[PDB]
Scaffold this active site. Structure first.
Site, short mmCIF file in Angstrom:
data_model
loop_
_atom_site.label_atom_id
_atom_site.label_comp_id
_atom_site.label_asym_id
_atom_site.label_seq_id
_atom_site.Cartn_x
_atom_site.Cartn_y
_atom_site.Cartn_z
N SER A 193 16.42 7.21 46.23
CA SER A 193 17.53 6.71 45.45
C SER A 193 18.87 7.06 46.04
CB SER A 193 17.46 7.30 44.03
OG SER A 193 16.19 6.95 43.44
N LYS A 233 5.82 0.28 36.11
CA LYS A 233 6.15 1.65 36.41
C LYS A 233 6.26 2.49 35.14
CE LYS A 233 10.07 4.47 37.92
NZ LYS A 233 11.41 4.65 38.57
N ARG A 270 2.95 12.76 42.15
CA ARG A 270 3.77 12.12 43.17
C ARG A 270 3.11 12.20 44.58
NH1 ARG A 270 8.69 11.25 40.98
NH2 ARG A 270 9.49 12.61 39.33
N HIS A 282 9.92 4.96 30.30
CA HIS A 282 10.05 6.40 30.43
C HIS A 282 9.93 7.17 29.15
CE1 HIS A 282 12.37 4.36 33.52
NE2 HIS A 282 12.13 5.41 34.29
C1 LIG Z 1 12.11 5.72 38.71
C2 LIG Z 1 11.47 7.04 38.59
C3 LIG Z 1 11.97 8.11 39.24
C4 LIG Z 1 11.19 9.33 39.36
O1 LIG Z 1 10.58 9.81 38.39
O2 LIG Z 1 11.14 9.86 40.48
C5 LIG Z 1 13.27 8.05 40.01
C6 LIG Z 1 14.16 6.96 39.44
O3 LIG Z 1 15.41 6.93 40.16
C7 LIG Z 1 13.42 5.62 39.47
O4 LIG Z 1 14.22 4.58 38.90
#
Ligand SMILES: *[C@H]1C=C(C(=O)O)C[C@@H](O)[C@@H]1O
Ligand SMILES: *[C@H]1C=C(C(=O)O)C[C@@H](O)[C@@H]1O
Ligand code: NI
Lengths: 265, 259
Positions: free
Chosen positions: A34, A183, A226, A156
């Protein structure tokens, strides 16, 4: 109502999405990083520096950008990123504050922001949050597809980890709404919660997915989620270049080192 | 020989090594047929980056000759002088290379204990409660630690059964309960990890070692620090069980995950 007078591929059968020659859903999980600059100057500096890192996809976290509501500023920043990182897919992500982001927008501003992003031709993918609502999401997914822009649909939970069955259903609902890559990120309160997220990943990927998915259990406690995408079924994972964009991310180099070891015959 | 143990700290200390704290410890297996094969392996291992040396005695050709076993153990201890040495006769039923009667097995282990050449012995749970319980006490009377082990090479049992086996091992006095199971599916790997976590948080007053075997379960050999397995096996040359990766790669992941 959008009429016409970038090009990614997707193989439902192979459960892959291909964006600029990157085949998401095949082999080792792909690394996403990011970029989180506040001003155009910050965004350009980060893009230049990131060029040295070994990542697969570049996510622009638009919610960190100060002039997010100035259309011309957003476009100059995207263009600048595109001019520096020319060979990697660029993902446009405005993450809302309640979903882990840094700012908040009205539903109207948010939809308008992603449409402008899609119209620009400067990004290969957009992130759309599930909580935006079924109607709006379904329409924006269609809008992106009409311009050969792929969609990562995200959900999320920063307080807790829902039951595996509920995680699986949300991933299926995202697929049903047309997401190219569903996601989900959830917060573990216990070590078992990390295993619940992995259980859901395996169940979704094995029984319902006809496309790649991305999953993660956040925080240091969840780091295994991860790293073990290849065996459990998460097609991509986030690494930190110099600062994490979510809790639990490890450095990009260490991340690649682990994924390679796990990919080894 | 003098090893320490703290039920309060859930640790086992052998020759300066604290099993149960920090990153998981690396164990490697030495497998030689003759005493010269053992010297060769030990010389080659002398370099490797591991924490515990396990001698797989079931690979030794003269296992039933008391003097040959003592000479082999002494040769290993002459070359590898600082690291804990673990004496393991792994039976054929549990992935070993040879089979012994219960009597031969118990006697082999008592002799190992008597020698003062090994710091730990491995005892298989399914040997018999009475024989195991006596041999654990015997080992303890000579300052020798015990890893009690159980294996399932064809399937992964329910998490609760895995948990009860680890509790029984503790009940019989094992210093470090150990279990190894075979995954047939991805869910099975997670089942092993679930059992590790449940045991650790709710029943363990000492360190445990767990593993899901094969390439599919390798993650169980790498994530012990978070889920609770205190040690993990790596391969110097050849794997002593399926799923083991090289010691270098193993140490690399363990370090990355500790930081
Ligand atoms: C999605 C999920 C993320 C993470 O949990 O690593 C990083 C975030 O910037 C993404 O949009
Ligand atoms: C115990 C477990 C092993 C493994 O699964 O790696 C190897 C074997 O030599 C040990 O006795
Ligand atoms: Ni158009």
């Amino acid at each position: 109502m959008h009429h016409h007078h970038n090009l990614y591929f997707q193989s439902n059968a192979m459960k892959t999405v291909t964006v600029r020659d990157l085949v998401v859903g095949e082999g080792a999980p792909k690394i996403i990083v990011s970029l989180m600059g506040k001003t155009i100057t910050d965004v350009k500096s980060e893009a230049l520096a990131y060029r040295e890192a070994d990542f697969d996809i570049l996510e622009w976290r638009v919610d960190h950008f100060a002039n997010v509501t100035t259309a011309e500023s957003v476009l100059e920043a995207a263009g600048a990123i595109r001019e520096i990182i020319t060979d990697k897919p660029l993902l446009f992500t405005f993450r809302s504050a309640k979903a882990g982001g840094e700012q908040a927008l009205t539903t109207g501003q948010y939809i308008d922001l992603n449409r402008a992003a899609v119209d620009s031709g400067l990004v290969d993918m957009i992130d759309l949050e599930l909580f935006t609502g079924d109607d709006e999401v379904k329409a924006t997914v269609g809008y992106a597809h009409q311009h050969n822009v792929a969609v990562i649909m995200s959900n999320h939970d920063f307080h807790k980890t829902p039951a595996a069955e509920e995680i699986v259903q949300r991933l299926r609902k995202m697929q049903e709404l047309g997401a190219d890559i569903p996601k989900i990120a959830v917060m573990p309160q216990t070590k078992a919660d990390v295993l619940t997220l992995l259980t859901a990943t395996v169940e979704m990927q094995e029984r319902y997915a006809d496309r790649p998915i991305i999953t993660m259990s956040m925080s240091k406690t969840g780091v295994i989620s991860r790293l073990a995408g290849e065996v459990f079924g998460s097609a991509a994972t986030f690494g930190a270049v110099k600062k994490a964009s979510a809790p639990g991310q490890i450095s990009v180099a260490d991340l690649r080192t682990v994924l390679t070891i796990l990919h080894q015959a």
